[PDB]
């Protein structure tokens, strides 16, 4: 075993950082950059494939984790959500060509973050 919780929180933090450039663009605070968008989408898709291996049943009582017990009661659903994110991100990479398509396609990707957090992450801090 190892400190899997530190592992996952780090990768998940990277996903949040990855969405920043995109949110800046939506908020009109940054000029649309296709290279930056694709870089963030690729990062998100790659991390989504690494995360399914980082949620072992013995990592629910750390004291510094926001992962809810339900993850282990609905593990098939939880894993698939990461799969849905990866698939959505990879698809987005191919459909997002300009600012108009970013605004139009980014929701399907980012909607996954909320879907999981609603059921599997503790509201707090
Ligand atoms: C999707 C684009 C997405 C983002 C963005 C995202 C971010 C995120 C952050 C920033 C955290 C906190 C990490 C930290 O402590 O620094 C976090 C935490 C959890 N998430 Fe999330 N998340 C995104 C997607 C998903 C998906 C698709 C799921 C589940 C299928 C998911 C789950 C979780 C869980 C659970 C945590 C808590 C981790 C822990 O404390 O052990 N996220 N997310």
Ordered by start, the domain boundaries in the chain are 1-125
CA of 16 to the centre of ligand 1 (A): 8
Tell the burial category of 33 from Cβ atoms under 10 Å away from its Cβ (0-12, 13-18, 19+): middle
Resolution (Å) of this entry: 2.3
Q: 12 in ligand 1 pocket by Cβ < 6 Å?
A: yes
* Experimentally determined by: X-ray
Q: For a pocket test of ligand 1, which of 11, 48, 109, 113 has the largest count of ligand atoms closer than 8 A to its C-beta?
A: 113
User: Which residues make Cβ contacts (< 8 Å) with residue 119, sequence separation at least 6?
Assistant: 68, 70, 74
**What is the separation, in whole angstroms, between the first and last Cα of the chain?**
28
Question: Are the C-beta atoms of residues 4 and 59 closer than 8 Å to each other?
Answer: yes
The token duo for 77 is 């659903």
Fold of domain 1-125: 1.20.120
């Amino acid at each position: 075993q190892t400190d899997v919780i530190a592992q996952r929180k780090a990768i998940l933090k990277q996903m949040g950082e990855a969405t920043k450039p995109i949110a800046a663009m939506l908020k009109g605070e940054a000029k649309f950059d296709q290279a930056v968008v694709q870089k963030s989408l690729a990062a998100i898709a790659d991390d989504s494939k690494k995360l399914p291996a980082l949620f072992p049943a013995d990592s629910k009582t750390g004291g510094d984790t926001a992962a809810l017990p339900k993850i282990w009661e609905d593990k098939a659903k939880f894993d698939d959500l990461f799969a849905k994110l990866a698939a959505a991100a990879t698809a987005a990479q191919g459909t997002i060509k300009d600012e108009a398509s970013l605004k139009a396609n980014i929701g399907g990707v980012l909607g996954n973050c909320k879907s999981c957090h609603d059921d599997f992450r503790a509201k707090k801090s």
